[model samples]
Every structure is written in C-alpha cells, then in structure tokens.
Target: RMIALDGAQGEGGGQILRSALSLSMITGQPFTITSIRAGRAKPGLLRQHLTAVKAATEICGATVEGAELGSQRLLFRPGTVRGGDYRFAIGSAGSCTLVLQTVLPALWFADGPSRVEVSGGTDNPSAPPADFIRRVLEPLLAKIGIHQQTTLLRHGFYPAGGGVVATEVSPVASFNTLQLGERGNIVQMRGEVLLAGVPRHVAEREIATLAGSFSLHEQNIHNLPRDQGPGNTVSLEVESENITERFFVVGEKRVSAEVVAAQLVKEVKRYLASTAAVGEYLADQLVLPMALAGAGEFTVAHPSSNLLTNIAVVERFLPVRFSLIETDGVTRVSIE
Candidate 1:
C-alpha cells in the first residue's frame, strides 16, 4: 500500500519529506508527497532537499519521480536497503546532518555494516549541528539498541557549504524500548565556540558571555581551525544523569557575539528548567527512532508542530499509534 503525505503539514518545511523518505525506506512502503515545503519562504526542493532524495535513492535503489530542484511533488518506491561504503555531497551549504538523518534509520536494519560520508554545512544556522547528532542523539539511540558513531571532519557554515561528517552504523537485530523520563541531576556543563574566518576575539567574547551564566572552565572552550569555514557558532552542552543535551546558535554577520551567546544561553536555560529527558529538538528527532523501535516513550515540555508532523507521517506508514499525556507542563509520549 502507498501512503499519501501533505508537505504543507505542521511547520511545513523539508522535515516532512525527510521523515517520509526514512519511514518509507524502513517499512518498504511507497509514498507520494505533494505541495512540498509549502510554507517556507521558498517552497519545494532546495539543494539540500534534492540531495536527500538522491541519497535515499542511492542507498535503497528506489524509483523516484519529481526529484528535480524546486519540484512540488515526489513519488518514491523503495527497494531492498543495501549497506556499504557510500559518499554524498549536497554541493550546497545545506545541513549535512539533516541529510544523514534521512537514511540513518534504514541503515540500522541493513544486511551489513554501513559507513556514510556527507558533505555540506556541518553547523548550519537553520538546523541542528553535527555535534548535536554525535553528542545528543547517538547516546539516546544507543539505549534503544541502535549503535552508530558520527564524527564531524570539518566545519561548514551557511552559503560557503564545505563541511564534512562521517557516520558508521551496525545492523540491529531488534530494538529495545527507551524509557527516558526525568533528566535527573546535572552531571556536567560545557561551552564551545567554533570560529572560521572569524576573529579570535569573537570566540573570546562568546566564551566570556557564556561564562557569565555557566560555571564553565577555560579548558571547555575551544577555537576550531579557520580553514573549513567562513562561519561562527557557539554551543552549550548540558550533561545530566539520564541524558546529555546540546544547544547551539550560529553567529550572523550583523549579530553581536554577546547576542549569539545570549540566544544559546536562553535555550540552555529553558532545557535546564524542564524535568524532561529530551529537549525540544531532541523530542522532535526521537519520534521516528522510537516508532521504529516499535515501543519506546519520552517526555518533553511540549510538542512542537514539527513533532506532530512526524507523528502524523509515522502513523500513516506503521500500524502503531502514539499516545501523548500532558500533566502540568510536561508531556509524555508513548508508542503503542
């Protein structure tokens, strides 16, 4: 049976397509998505979205239609997923991490181990950084019996798009349910500044600003090599008993170092304020992985449109249903 998806759903961005591509490949269910990214400033397939289609196609040997740039619809039919050494280049500053997410789940069930190399923006302004995938998501997936390693080889910022990330996946025999509830005590907190083509003082000021709110150590702050990017980013990591979450914000040309640091600080504070194990971004990301696990649950402060959109797409393909219980400010999502 084929599933039909409306790309205009929820936040109405590339995630709708990305999630659908992953689920379709995992379930071996064909799907067609229309009105792709209808609510974005520039709707339809961007270079990044196009690259996602190509990546999924290569891994699964899928039949695809409307795969061109700026298309509003796509028809994807899956074949058996094959795991091997593969490399894909977005050829733009799109989020390489997002593209990796598109096919990572399917690779877990492949016949053999897989290594994927993706080239694009490692720390794109609009999406989660590669570090978030490596530090935040990978650990959580490990609890549910999915083992993968992600490494950021180079830093790529927006527009310039020259970064690279490599990931290796081992096939999973079965998934274990994740029962992530309270975040428990704070284990550690660290901050980092990645600067490329940006001045050294920018990193100093950003780190200084973070130091004001967090009892950070000098050794925790790092200045990355300047060759890979014309980019700047500040990241704050919260390591708790149950989980470690990372928050990042990129520096804009017009934005001050303090302003960028302030934005990231606010995000870190908001997550710290919650008892939930997963932050907002992590909550959205876990939906697919948990669904594939067939039985897992997590808590988040609230469900964003992106999270809801993911749930909708997952239900269309899988027989499972997600039940959300909201008590006080926290919401517990269970797959049943």
Candidate 2:
C-alpha cells in the first residue's frame, strides 16, 4: 500500500515523519511525505532526525530518499523488521530516546529479542528524559504487554551531549488491552533534583520549592561528579494508585533555580488537579502501542497537538481509527 502524508499538517514536525517510519516498517506500508518538518524553525531534517532515519534504515533495511540535512520530502519503502543489538551515536546533543522510539514498535514484531542503545542527549526537554522513560513510560508500556527495560548509562545535557540509554525488548506474541480511565488514590509524590558540575545550592532550592507544595520524600538530591556535568534537572514522581506519572524541567544557564523549581511544581499541580489517568505528554506516546494492539483506550486532559498529530499519522498507515470524545475537561481516546 502507498501512503502520502503532509508534513505541514497537525504537529508538523519530526514526530510526523517518525511515526510514519515506524508504521511503514511494522505494517509493510510504503509512504512518501512532503514538506518534512515544515513547521519547525529549521523546517527540515536536523541531525537527530537524520540519525533516526539512518537507524530506522538499519533495523528494517528500508530504502529511504531525502534523508539528508535539509531535505523537505522523504520516500520510504521498508524491508522485514529485524531485531538485534543495535547502537546509534547521534554525534551531538540530540535526544537518544526519540531515536529509540522510532524503531521500537517494529522490533516488537521482530524475529528475536532486540537491544537498542542510543547515545546522545538524555536530559533534554525537547524529548522525554531517560528517567521519565524508565520510570513513567516503561511501566505503562508493560501493561500493553511489551516487555522492555531502559537504563540511562549517563546524563547528557544540551550543547555537550555524551549520554547513553539502552533498552532490551523481547518480541511480543500478543498485546493486551490497556483500559485506563480514572486515576486512583494518591500514593506519594517524590521530588528529585539532578546536578552535575552544578552547585548544591541549586538542587537545594529546587527541592525546597517542591517541599513547599507537595509531601515529597526526603533525600531527593542527586549529585553527579562535575566531570559528567554541567547539567541540572528537577523531576517530580507522582505515584497514584492507578499510575505513576513523572514530570521534569531542565535548568538552563541564567535561569533562576526558583524559576526552574516553580515550573516543575506547576506541571505536577496540573496533573494532580486532573481526574484523568494519562497526562498530555503520556497520551502521544500511548498511540503507538495502542495502534499496535488494535484496541485500547485511555482518558486524558487537554490532548496536545502532538497526540492528535500522532493519531492522524497512525490512521494514515494502519487500519485503526481513533475516536476522541471530550467531556467536562477530559478526553477519552479509543482506537477501534
């Protein structure tokens, strides 16, 4: 089958192309997308995206065109999805998590177990942090019956990225239905501040701010040797009865530690106020596994453009159709 996607539509960025590549390999659907990442500032493929394409080509042996630095269109015809221990070095502070996600779903259907290690930026806000994947995303992914383990070998920050994260996935014989709706009782929320080549005062202030709002567990400060640094991140882990939600904010130079901690507090507040089990960030990532399962549903508050865009992309390549119904500030997404 042939599919055509408009890169300018919906989220209009790397996600559009990444989802297309994943579905192309998984479903044996060939696609050609025009105006790739046309909505971004760069408006075309960057180093991270190009590496994603390159890695996707390797796992599935796809025939790809327009995979360079500034191309605005791409044609991908994929081969059989295969699984192995594959490593990709993105050469800069690009998100390794993003690259791993591009080929992960396809690996679920591969001939054997697969190990994907992507080395690049791990703490970047542009993509989900490595810890978020290991803690939040991976736990929920297990409910979908896809078995995998993620490890952050090191911390990689912007401009001087030298991080490593790996995941080992076993081929799935089945995908279980994930029916997540109302989140259960509040368990506990833990706050952690990660710093490398950063001052302890920075971590203390960030932790102080979090302690002001929620009941956070103590000993939340983590210090990495100055050698692997200069990086800082504040993360809140909410362990509700039904789900474990994690939110994080990166600290940039010149940004006040109070300001960074406040931002993280704000994110946690939003989720705490919502009755929905899934947050906006988690919604988009769920699309891939739900589409693969052919039937699954979850309730989310304020679906993001990224989530909507991912649903549209999945529809373009798979037979699944997604229905989003909003009621009283909550939206239920169902793939039928």
Candidate 3:
C-alpha cells in the first residue's frame, strides 16, 4: 500500500484525520501520519474526530491503531464496508456534521443501504449546523452521486450539546462532480432560531435580527423550540438555484442572541456575493468525494489555504486532476 501524509501543516486538526479516515476506508489503503493538527491552538484529535473515527471503523471495520483524543499519530487499515443501521454519539457537544462528512462519501458507495443516527452538537460554534447538512450538503451531494434523507430531530447546542440527526443512505456505484459556475438566482431565505431554557427574549431577538440581516421578504423566519439542551442557536439559510447554504452562529453562555444572529447573517451575505459552486469549507471537502467517484467537477471561489490543504491531502489518495476554468468571471473546478 502507498501512503503519504504530513502531521504539521495548515489547518492541521480535524481535516487531516478526516481526510485520512475517509480515503483509507474507501480506497482500502493503510496509512500512518504523525503531528496531527499542528496549526490549531489546541491541536490533535478532539472528541468529534474520535467519534468520527469510531463510526467509520464500525461502518467499514477498519483496523485503526493509535486512535484516541489528542494523540499525534494514527494508523488505519480498512476492511470491507458493512451497511446497516448504526448509531454514533459524541457524548458531548461535538459537531456531528463533521463526523457525517468524513464517512458519507465512503458510505455512498457501500455495498448495501445504511441508516445513521448521530447525537452531539448539531450547531456547534465552529462546525456546520444541522441545517447545513440537511439543507445544503445532502441535496448537493445527491445531485452528484449520493442519495440520502437527512433530518434534524432536535436542536443540539455546544457545551450542552445533545442534538440528534438521522440520515438514510443508499449506495451509488459512482458519483460525479458538480459544475456550479454561477448562482442562478435567489429563491428563498429561511431562518431557524433555536432557544432552550433561555429567556424568550433571546429567541425573539434572533428572529428580529435575521429578518433584517437576510432581508426576508415575508414571514420566512422561524423560531424552532428546542426539545433538549440549554442554549441558543441561529441558523440562517440562503437558497439559490444550484444550492442552499446554511450559515450558523452558535451562542455561548454570555454572548447576546442578537450578536450571534448578526454574525451568521454577515457570513451568509458574504458567501451570497460569490459565484462559486461550493463554499470555502465545501470546496475543501468535495475534493475527496469527487476524487473517489473518479470523475466529477464543480466551481468554487478562489482557492483558500484550507482548500489547498485539502487538495494536497486528496492527491495522496488519487491523482486529483484539477483545472481552474474561468467563465463569466467565475472559476470552477473540473476533474479529468
């Protein structure tokens, strides 16, 4: 088996482990890497990464040696993938979407169908919210090669994270890349503000801010009551012709709800201006899956450091042939 990796590099935290784990499982390659996430302040495998590793191991039955939270090195050898119902819980407020992302590509081509229920931080401060997964990634991925039904059963927030998300997936023999050159048009703008155990004022402030920030036409904003956890979250969704983007701001104990809502709105607006097919995070992420599919393409904004890092990681697994083709002042990636 051929393996290559760098432990100390840009954005060296979860993505390194995620990329390695995802590719190792799908490609049947055994890999070893050290100095994990050297760029992060508190670098190394956190609870989210650990949970993702364990979940992938169960799905694909990988021999994951040197796996643990905060450990610097890991060795993974994978076996045949088994599809069925599975449950993975972070037991903390760790982001469940991250775990799902790591394994979704591999499972999309599994021998059988699968159902996954993951519990953890559905809207963590630094990770994708549940809406991003259900509304954005899931649909776009399906367009390329994955067929899945995703739902957020409950709101899970950070620090008190216990959110639950369920997904049903069917295997596809192959997936292709998407070529999203320009965002065709804006169709709808929706928002979900989740408040739990907090003063009702916090929830109201979230909607009020979203209505103004996203400039919703009518009563498009919603306040979703939380069934569990004790925190606040704002998920601002922007629906476009080719994609739906969910930008979220997770509330902390002391932060004001308005501030969180405003932050999410600001980020979403920034993305809306771009004509890229994938967002920055999604651009970095799509590399592995499209490569696994062996033929796919998509448009994204100019490459970011994170995007470049992911490209490098994907090159280790496949001869990722990417070209920057410009059209109408927008750059899209096409695989050859």
Candidate 4:
C-alpha cells in the first residue's frame, strides 16, 4: 500500500511524520508527505524529525528520498528489518523521544534485538523528556509484553542542547492485549525544573510558580543543578494505577518562567481532574504500541485534537481504533 500524508495534520506538528514513519515500518507500506511540521515556529523537518527519518530508514534499511533537514516533504519506502546497536543524535536540543517514537515501533518487530544510543535534546519545547519514557511509557509497554530499557546519560535543555538517552528494546514478534480503563490510583507524582547556564534564579522561580499554582507541597518539587546547556524546562509526572503520565512546560526566548509554570500547572490540573490513566499527549504516545500489541485499551481525558489526526494516519496503514468514552470531562480509549 502507498500512503500520502498531509504535512499539516494535527496541529501541523511533527506527529504527521512520526506517525507516518511508524505505520510505514509496521505495514511495509511506502508513504509520501507534504507540509511537514507546519505548526512549528520554524516548520518542516527539524533535527529531531530528520533523526527519526534516519532511524526508521536504518531500522528497515528502507529506501528514502527528501529526508533532509528542513524539507517540507518526503518519500519513504520500507526495506529489510535488521536489529543491532544504533546511535543517533540531533546535534541540538531536539527531542530524542520523538526520534524513538518514530522508529522504535518499527524496530519492535525487527528480526533480532536492538539498542539505541540517542544524543541531543532529551528535553525540548515540544517533546517528552527522558524521565517520561523511563517512568511512564516503559512500564505501560511492559504490561503488553514489550520490553524496553532506558538510561539518561545527560540532560539536554533546548537551545544550548547537549542531552543524551539510551534505549534497549527486545520486541515480541506479536503483541498481546493492554487495557487502561480508569486512572486508578495516584501511585506517585514528582516535578522537576531544570536550568542550564541560566539564572539560578530561573529554576527557583519556576519551581516556586509550580508550587503556588498547583498548591503542591514543597516536598513535591525538585530543582536540578544548573546544566551546561542553553535550555530550560519544567516537568510533572503522575503515576496512576494502570499507567504513568507526564506534562511539561518548555521555556522559550520570550516566554516568562512564571507563565511556563502556569501553563504546565493548568495541564496538570486537568489530568488530576480526569479519571483516566493517560493524558492526551500520553494517549498519542501510547497509540502505536497498543495497536502493535494487536489488542489494548486505555482511557484518556478525551482524545487530543492532535491525536485524532494521528489515529487517522495510523488507520490508513493498519487497522486501529480509539473508542471515545465521554464520562463527565474525560474520554476513555479502548483499542483492538
């Protein structure tokens, strides 16, 4: 099958390319995309997106064209699946998780085993950090019989970059069932705000903001030592009965630290109010594994508008469903 993807799908973010690369690897289908990352400040394939394309190409040794940095479109063709050790870097503070998301789903079915050493930007403005993968996604994946191990070598903040994370995946040829019906218990919750080469004051400011906005006890907040990079980010993790979820606010050139904290705290509040195990972004992150597992279910606080587009792309390649259960303000997603 051949797939054509609109570059502008789902908030015009890189999810278009990430989801496309995922399905292409799984279904052995070729795909073409236009308008890549259209929603980003600087649209098209960023370093992270390019790294993903490269990783997917290497995973299957696929045939690819237009997989260049900043390219607005691409042509990707699947090839053989070879499992081995792979190392990738984005050269800047780009999200390594995004790269992993793009290719790991494909590598899960590779002939042998695989280990990935990814450098550059484990934490970024628009992507999940290394902690989220270690604490949330990994356990959820384990429940469905996929085993992945992660280590954080260094923390990468945006702009100044310089972050690395490693992952080792042993994929089962076929996946089983996974169900996340309710939020279950709040197993644990933690928050971290990292600053790199910035004001010691910045970290303090962000953490103070989180505590004030969320009404979180001082015990819940952590401030990391200043990093030797050029990025800043605040993250919150929630461990529920069935799964772990995370939310974040990335610092930007013009955005105030307080504003960033407020934005993330608001997101946290919504998740706290929901009875689901996953948040919207976590929902999007889980879709591929659940689908690959062949049968799975999880409830999120209503599906993300962005994720609806992501699911649309997934269905075009392999059959998958995200049933929306509206109870109060949340939506429970059960997939098979």
Q: Which candidate has the top score in TM-score?
A: 2
Tens digits of per-residue lDDT for model 2 on 1-336?
A: 689888887767888888988999999899999998876788798878898899889998889889898789989999988889999999899899999889888898899999999998898886988788889888888888888888998887888888998999998877899988887888888889898999899988888888868887654888898788689988998888898888999999889999998998898889878899988898999998999888899999999999999998888887899999988889999986
Q: What digit string (tens of lDDT, one per residue) describes model 1 on residues 1-336?
A: 888888888878999899999999998999999999867788899988999999999999999999998999999999999999989999988889888999888899999999999999887766878788888999888988999999998877777888898899999877898988899988878888877788888888888888868876332545666666677888888888888888899888899998999998898888888788889989999998898888999999978999999999999988889999987789999997
TM-score of each model, paired residue for residue: 0.97, 0.97, 0.89, 0.89
Model 3 scores a TM of 0.89
Model 2 scores a C-alpha lDDT of 0.88
How would you encode candidate 3's per-residue C-alpha lDDT over 1-336 as one tens digit per residue?
Answer: 858577775656677778778888878887888888756777777888889889888988788776788877778888887888899998888888888877876777787898888888876776766667667777777777778877888777667777888888899866666666666688878777666767777767788877855666433334455446577667766777877666777677677777787777778766777776577667776676667666677776666666677767777877667676767655677677
**Root-mean-square deviation of every model:** 1.3, 1.1, 2.5, 2.7
Question: Which residue pairs collide in model 1, if any?
Answer: none
Cα lDDT for residue 308, candidate 2: 92
Which of the predicted structures, 3 or 4, would earn the higher TM-score when compared with the native?
A: 3
Q: What's the CA error at residue 126 for candidate 2, in Å? A: 2.0
Error of 2 at 149 (Å): 0.9
Q: Work out how many backbone clashes candidate 4 has.
A: 4
- What is the C-alpha lDDT profile of model 4 across 231-332, one tens digit per residue? 677887776666667788877788888888889889898887878777877788777777777678777777876678877886888777766668877776
Better of 1 and 3 by TM-score: 1
